[PDB]
Design a protein around this nucleic acid. Structure first.
Lengths: 158, 75
RNA sequence: UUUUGUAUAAUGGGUCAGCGACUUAUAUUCUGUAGCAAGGUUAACCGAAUAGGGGAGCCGAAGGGAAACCGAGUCUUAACUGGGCGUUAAGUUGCAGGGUAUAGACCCGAAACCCGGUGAUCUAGCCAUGGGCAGGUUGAAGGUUGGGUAACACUAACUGGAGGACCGAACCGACUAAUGUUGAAAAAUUAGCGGAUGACUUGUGGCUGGGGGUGAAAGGCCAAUCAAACCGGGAGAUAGCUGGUUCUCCCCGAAAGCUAUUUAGGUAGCGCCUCGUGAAUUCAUCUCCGGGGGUAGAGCACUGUUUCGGCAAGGGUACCAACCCGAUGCAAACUGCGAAUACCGGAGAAUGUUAUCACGGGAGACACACGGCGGGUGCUAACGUCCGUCGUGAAGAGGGAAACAACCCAGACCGCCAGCUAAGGUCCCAAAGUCAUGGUUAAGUGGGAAACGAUGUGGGAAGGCCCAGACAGCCAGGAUGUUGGCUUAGAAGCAGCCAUCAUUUAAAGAAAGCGUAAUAGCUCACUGGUCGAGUCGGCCUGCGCGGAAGA
RNA sequence: UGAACUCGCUGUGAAGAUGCAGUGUACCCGCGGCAAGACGGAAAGACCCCGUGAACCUUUACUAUAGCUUGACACUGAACA
RNA sequence: CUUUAAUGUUUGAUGUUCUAACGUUGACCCGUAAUCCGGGUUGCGGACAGUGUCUGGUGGGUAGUUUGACUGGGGCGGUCUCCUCCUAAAGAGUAACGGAGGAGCACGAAGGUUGGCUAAUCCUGGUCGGACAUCAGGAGGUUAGUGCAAUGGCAUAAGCCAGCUUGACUGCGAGCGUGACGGCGCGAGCAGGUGCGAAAGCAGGUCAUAGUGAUCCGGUGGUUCUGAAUGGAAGGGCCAUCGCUCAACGGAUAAAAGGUACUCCGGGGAUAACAGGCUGAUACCGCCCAAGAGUUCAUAUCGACGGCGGUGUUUGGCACCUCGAUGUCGGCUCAUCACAUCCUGGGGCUGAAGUAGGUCCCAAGGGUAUGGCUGUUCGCCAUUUAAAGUGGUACGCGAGCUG
RNA sequence: UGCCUGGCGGCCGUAGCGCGGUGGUCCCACCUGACCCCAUGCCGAACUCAGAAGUGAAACGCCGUAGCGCCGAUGGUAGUGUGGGGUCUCCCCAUGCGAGAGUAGGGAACUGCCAGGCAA
């Protein structure tokens, strides 16, 4: 006994995977191990639009029902892991900059702990300049410099 | 869970005795072969009996098994 | 008005007077009307102009295909004995009317969104400037005096003066109770409670202006209104939702059904409603003829199910049991059999305002309830829900049933002080037999209710004994061992193992009841005499009683 | 406040009767009190449901973006290793 | 030209130095009695910063939306298409969250034709082999088989085997069945060319019902059909075919999950919760045959195995009135009535010696408490009596009051 | 004209089975060989070729036998359409139709065409 609800859920997952791979770029398509026919179908889906694109995606999902998906899932998982790591690094940098702008000495100490080589004097000067810019409605030059410095420190650590 | 409904096949007898019919008309709609075609009566793939020529549909019992036969006479 | 359904105790109304609800324009379809007629017709514009010019323009008479293209033929295919669409009916301009779609297009009733402005004299916060917070209470630091230590600390006094400190006015907060909820006020008043030198309050002036301000940070307040203020515009927003739609008469007059729907109270198609045109003894009733069923009924050939008896594979031979055999059953999901209705076609006398079918215009409706008929479901309970058909009401008043649309008879054109009749009644209220014939009932049954019970009543089949006199009665009898062997404790007939014998005999059994420790004693089985006729145990029962007690 | 010549009981009735059928009682009209009912009056129920109705809020629901942010292009040049 | 080397040209990535662009809310002077602004000198960094367009990523902070339907209140649980059997009342068709089950395949053959053939269950004989393998004989007549769950049919076999082929072909299709419709199915027959068979004749798929998706759009082959001046091409039109668990399967978007007790609006007793009515499984009570208990002895008292009766005092179903408002459990004042009687009163039986008791009939004229436990109705405990009774009145009374 | 035979149809269990008898004058069947035609998942089994030497055992055609199987009335019964009644989850009244099974009985066949042998 196989539940038609489970079948529908599996179909939805397959269609989601098809849409994701279609959205993925040319380099991602090359990296993912797709057969020639599936690659041609994906390219046709990308070229077409409107309800035709959705029905081509439905065809992709129907083909994936029979074709193996584990390599495709692994490739998508690794690509998404890399993208999420990059996004998390960017979010951490943005949050650290925001804390530096808002609190002050606590954020400076956190930055020093994350990167011992970080210059306390430079960080203090940049934070004071950013506060002055905020007070005088000046361009966020200090904020941009802080972001660049944090990115450089992260790159050096990595 | 049980009791799922399905549209009926609308089987039965369409033409009865004493009624004139035209060529190609369907006489009886049956799933199996309840009635066997005879003279001027042809049987399709779906075990449906049709008239090959104008006439009045007639029913007779023939054969060793006494199976019911449908025949048409040009009257 | 709502609905299957109303006085219902579901909706609205106090009334009078006035005002108020399907209009209008653009294009389309159809009807009636007027003309012309294979032609009709003008728009704008000119016009001393509702005339006359203006044929610009539009519509059909020739259509098919997507088109090329072809042509009364065309499209499909190399093309058909082929098939779809054209020919044999004449179109057009105005008027009025029935619809269609656009415009708010029958009207009233919403929340809610955007745009442009107004407010911080009410209210929240902040800023600046002034005032007020009675009175009485213990007092921390510091200073001074005597004792005390080498010196401090400590001790007993004077000065000293801070409490989100204490009691307690004015004042402030509404924390609690009540007053009131159109109020005294669209949140105020009374009586307590809390603070009463502190983040206190207040007069005055300014700022914070609405996806925003403010909030010692409950969605509170922002001019009596705030989970998004007020004023004007979009905007008479939209609304599958509530409600109303106003004068009269006549004819016809259904449904709450099927398919479909982001669809269940909305709406599209068909049946059902109505008007017109064209069509065949077209259709209905009844008689006859030819029909296939698989329902009732019946049965178990087959499919399940069920009991008994037997051979019994297999299984662990006093022991469980498959495949089977004979009988009894059951089945909406079984039919070796099988109908009456139901339906199709043909023939026919007669009736039915063609009651039958095709097309066009407009509908309404798509919430149905009950009884009968065979049911699913529910408890073979429900004024419970869902199926196929007739009727009722919805859409039908009247008469009967006390009142009740679904129970019974019966379809209101109007009037008449007429008769008959259907159901239902005839003692009367309340109209009519206190009618007649042969019976049942002694209970207020009639005038709610069952398993069961019973010398109630009338009869039937009957059954046993009966003037060689029956049943029950009237003065009579039941005498002797049988205090028994037996479990001897006494059962002796009146508790049991036991025979169930025997004399007097018109007649008596080794025994049925009452009670004594057992005794004993009194009746009954049968028997003398009179009267004497009928006497006794059950079944069927129609009609009767109990079981039957609710405010 | 539809209009009232506005009694109780049994049963029915859109199912709790001042108004129906049967029955019993009751002179008509006023005033001081009680309050069983006329499902008293109040708010087009806050409770349950309907609406391809509205508004606020939440996000790993959908669609975009303020903001943040990577790089390229002009302001933006001169000397050389 | 592939492959290299010095000078001379285009420059790009990168580093340093400089300043003339650029900022200076750094300093000094003037317009100026001037913390604005502008102008002149210098220094500070300096082609960095930022600015304008695009682009990669993040982004309920903001703006516009969605979260379907059936459902014995709602959520959860189960379903949304097609096929078989009964309900489905002997034409067709006919519902339920009724009962039993399947399908979204597959076959270049399992299709067409020609020829030939006919199984289950058991008995007998026989090495493994034994009831059930395969071999010979015996009855059999569809119980076998007919690919897929089911139904009917299949002896001419629609079942099995063998020789050849793709008619599983192209262009049509009168005439009918089925649905409101889109639509789906049957279908003799006409033209061309084929397969089987010498032939009459059969073959336009599978013994027959599910194995499928309209429309828009796009992909491939063909077509001068058209291609907006001409000659082409691009783009379009038509014929053949492919693309959707669009499974919410007659499918509104290519694109959407939840709360609001801070909610509102227009309505529904079409639809709920307290009360009314119907109904009476359940609950209470009474009784019948009666095994048996009761020191023997059924009915002094209980009394299984079974059934029959009254009420609505709990649990049950409809929502038939009510959502344009019926204020839903307790306490107080007011109480009313029935007896299925706690006592008082009159009686029967008794395993009733007397007081004191056990059971039943009539009788409602009358009486029928206080405190702790919970909000409680009710019920338990302690104390007195004659008791400290059971029930209906919206589980009486909020048009009486405190919740 | 008929005792017979083989085939072609109607009717198809009154038509088919159990038992005995009956036939080789023609026809039918059995049978011999298959070298050749023909084919066996091996076989003259099945089918086919030339014969009929030999026979009527099996089958085949006919008769008797009722033992089955089968058909089958009449009446009754279940049921049921119509209009009603009742102690109305059921039954009854008037009317129309009318089962299944069983009984009496029938029953072990009839019929048209062609071709061949016998006597006529």
């Amino acid at each position: 006994w196989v539940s038609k609800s489970e079948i529908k859920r599996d179909a939805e997952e397959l269609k989601r995977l098809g849409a994701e791979i279609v959205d993925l770029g040319k380099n991602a398509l090359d990296k993912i191990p797709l057969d020639a026919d599936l690659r041609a179908a994906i390219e046709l889906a990308q070229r077409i639009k409107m309800e035709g694109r959705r029905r081509q995606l439905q065809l992709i999902g129907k083909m994936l029902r029979q074709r193996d998906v584990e390599p495709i899932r692994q490739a998508l998982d690794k690509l998404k892991n890399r993208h999420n790591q990059q996004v998390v690094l960017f979010h951490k940098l943005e949050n650290l900059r925001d804390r530096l702008i808002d609190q002050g000495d606590d954020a400076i100490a956190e930055v020093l702990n994350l990167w011992p080589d970080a210059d306390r004097q430079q960080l203090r000067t940049l934070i004071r300049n950013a506060k002055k810019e905020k007070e005088g409605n000046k361009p966020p030059k200090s904020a941009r410099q802080i972001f660049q410095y944090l990115r450089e420190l992260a790159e050096n650590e990595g | 869970r049980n009791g799922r409904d399905s549209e009926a096949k609308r089987l039965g007898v369409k033409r009865f005795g004493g009624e004139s019919v035209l060529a190609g008309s369907i006489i009886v709609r049956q799933r199996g072969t309840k009635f066997h075609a005879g003279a001027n009566v042809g049987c399709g793939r779906d075990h449906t009996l049709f008239a090959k020529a104008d006439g009045k549909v007639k029913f007779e019992v023939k054969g060793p098994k006494n199976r019911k036969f449908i025949s048409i006479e040009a009257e």
